[PDB]
């Protein structure tokens, strides 16, 4: 059977924003914005349930050349903990070596 899939994202505004009702509401309804609308569309296509979590350390991250640790969203994704990063994560050479990007959904 299928199990719900974690999805990791960073607030960064207006991609993700806090609902003005988080004092009371529970679950995904805490969050709204362009990212959430895109998430629901992908979920409707692929047919998976998803649970949002805010990223643990607030940063996109890159490999530290000293410790070889990956921090950030890429840290939570590479070490097998997040499974998808729907985020404004910029494609750059050092990232393609460890994760796969779709074709780009926006240009800047």
């Amino acid at each position: 059977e299928q199990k719900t899939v974690v999805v990791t994202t960073i607030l960064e505004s207006p991609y993700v924003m806090m609902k003005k009702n988080h004092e009371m509401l529970e679950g995904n309804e805490r969050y709204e914005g362009y990212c959430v609308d895109l998430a629901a569309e992908i979920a409707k296509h692929c047919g998976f349930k998803y649970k949002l979590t805010i990223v643990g350390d607030g940063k996109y991250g890159a490999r530290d050349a000293d410790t070889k640790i990956w921090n950030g969203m890429v840290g939570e994704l590479v070490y097998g903990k997040a499974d998808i990063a729907i985020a404004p994560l910029t494609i750059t050479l050092v990232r393609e070596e460890v994760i796969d990007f779709s074709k780009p959904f926006m240009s800047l």
Partner: protein, 108 residues
């Protein structure tokens, strides 16, 4: 034909009902129809072609406006060929080092 957001549809309804026929079936006919019509006629085409046609003689037209969408060209490889995966790195490593900008400037 599948436009949204309640601005393009006015143009679509116009082109569906104007007389005489506003469309042309080859691009050079569109260029000629612009060039002869003393600026009373305008045409829609791929920006990369527009930005080249500007630079040829007679040098009598100019680009105006931004864009309506975004699309990109890409290298193509036959499915499952081992050659495809290093090319996907090569294209990235070139873009971050200015080569694909200098090669554009050289020719346009």
């Amino acid at each position: 034909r599948r436009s949204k957001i309640a601005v393009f549809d006015k143009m679509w309804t116009y082109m569906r009902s104007a007389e005489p026929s506003v469309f042309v079936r080859t691009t050079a006919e569109g260029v000629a129809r612009v060039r002869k019509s003393k600026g009373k006629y305008a045409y829609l085409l791929e920006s990369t072609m527009n930005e080249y046609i500007e630079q040829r003689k007679p040098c009598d037209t100019m680009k105006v406006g931004g864009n309506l969408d975004s699309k990109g060209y890409g290298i193509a490889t036959p499915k499952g060929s081992s050659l495809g995966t290093p090319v996907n790195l090569a294209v990235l490593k070139l873009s971050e080092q200015g080569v694909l900008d200098k090669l554009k400037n050289k020719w346009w």
